[PDB]
Each structure stands twice: as C-alpha cells, then as structure tokens.
C-alpha cells in the first residue's frame, strides 16, 4: 500500500526484458492500473510522485 | 385573508436541474440530480437522478 | 543496514560508492546533488538509493556483544 490508502497485491511478476521500458532504460519496479485514480480521488498520490 | 392564504400552502422545494442526461422513459433533457454516498467508503457518491419533463427517477453508477 | 549492492531497478553496483559519497560531504563541503553527479550516477533510478538509504548498521553496532 501507498501512503494514500491504495492497498493492493501483486498479480504476477515479470523480468525486465518484457517489462515496459523508457528511453533512458529506467525499467519500472511496479505498475498499477489507472482506474484506481479517479474514483478514489487520490490526487496527493500523483503530486507526491 | 391574503396573508393567511399565503401561509396555508406549504413547502415547495424545486429540484435544481441540468441538461446533460436524457430521461429513462420520456427521453428528454431536463435532468436534475443530487450527490451523497450511501455504501462503504471504497466507492464514490451515488449520483441520484430525477427527471422533470415527466418526473422520472433513475440512477447512474 | 549497509548500502544495497546493485540498484534494484537498474543493476549497477552501488556500495563501492558509499563511503566516497560520505567524504564528499565531510571535508569537501560539497552540495550533495553535485556530489552524486561527480560520483557519476546520471540515471536517477540508481540515484535514489544513495540519496535515501539510511545507515542503521552502526547504530546497531554500538552495542557490546560478547
Ligand atoms: Zn422524463
Ligand atoms: Zn539504478
């Protein structure tokens, strides 16, 4: 969970070579779904990021 | 007598509207709403609906 | 705890750089952002670790076991 009440669990895991990746190669640690944003109305999470 | 007749007839709350949705039965845009949340905290408000072209009620999630 | 070896995101070895990053802030009086830059960590996934790692190991170490 975050510091904003976004509790959740791990669905599955991936290695880097099929994790998505950005131009500098910063491969992310973890990906959460966008739909947890609007209905939870958790703006400060985004601001913190 | 005029003041008494005014004081006889009572509450007339009037249901402020918008024009975005259409009626579930009449299908016209005179729609009025409200907000509050009913169930537990994990979900948002209820988005109550109230038509005024015919008086219909429905709801959106 | 020690610094981690090998940044979780990227994989570059970190841990050689720790005491260096310390003495860049002890006598050289240097600003720390430039300190990491002159330490040579230009991606930021690597950079977060040295910037945020806390060193509890010596606070453990000030006991007297055996
Ligand atoms: Zn209607
Ligand atoms: Zn890294």
Brief write-up:
The structure is cut from a larger assembly and holds chains A (49 residues), B (61 residues) and C (66 residues). Chain A has 49 residues and is low in regular secondary structure.
Overview of this structure, please?
This is part of a larger assembly, with chains A (49 residues), B (61 residues) and C (66 residues). Helix content of chain A is 12%, strand content 0%. With 49 residues, chain A is low in regular secondary structure. The longest helix of chain A is centred in the C-terminal third of the chain and has 6 residues, at 43-48. Chain B has 61 residues and is low in regular secondary structure. Chain B contains one helix and two strands, in the order H-E-E. Chain B has one helix at residues 2-8, and strands spanning 32-34, 48-50. A two-stranded antiparallel ribbon of chain B has the order 1-2. Chain C is flat, with a radius of gyration of 13 Å. Chains A and C meet through loops of A and loops of C. Residues 23, 25-26, 28, 51, 53-54, 56 of chain B line the site of one zinc ion (ZN).
Given helix and strand content, the structural type of chain A is little secondary structure
The tally of helices of chain C reads 4
Level-2 CATH architecture of chain C: Orthogonal Bundle
Catalogue the ligands: zinc ion
Shape of chain A: globular
Please tell me how large the radius of gyration of chain A is. Answer: 13 Å
Main beta-sheet strand count, sense and barrel state of chain C: none
How many beta-strand runs of chain A? 0
**What would CATH call the class of chain C?**
Mainly Alpha
Spell the H/E element sequence of chain C.
HHHH
Shape of chain C: flat
Strand pairing plus helix content of chain C: what structural class?
Answer: mainly alpha
Domain unit count of chain C: 1
State the CATH superfamily name of chain C: Homeodomain-like
| Topology of chain A as a string of helices (H) and strands (E) | H
Q: Can you count the helices of chain A?
A: 1
CATH fold name of chain C: Arc Repressor Mutant, subunit A
Radius of gyration from the alpha-carbon trace of chain C, in angstroms: 13 Å
Proportion in β-strands of chain A: under 5%
Largest sheet geometry of chain A: none
Our measurement of the CA-to-CA distance between the termini of chain C, rounded to an integer number of angstroms, reads 20 Å
PDB class: transcription
Keywords: Transcription. POL II, transcription
Entry title: consensus map of PICdeltaTFIIK form1
Chain A: DNA-directed RNA polymerase subunit beta
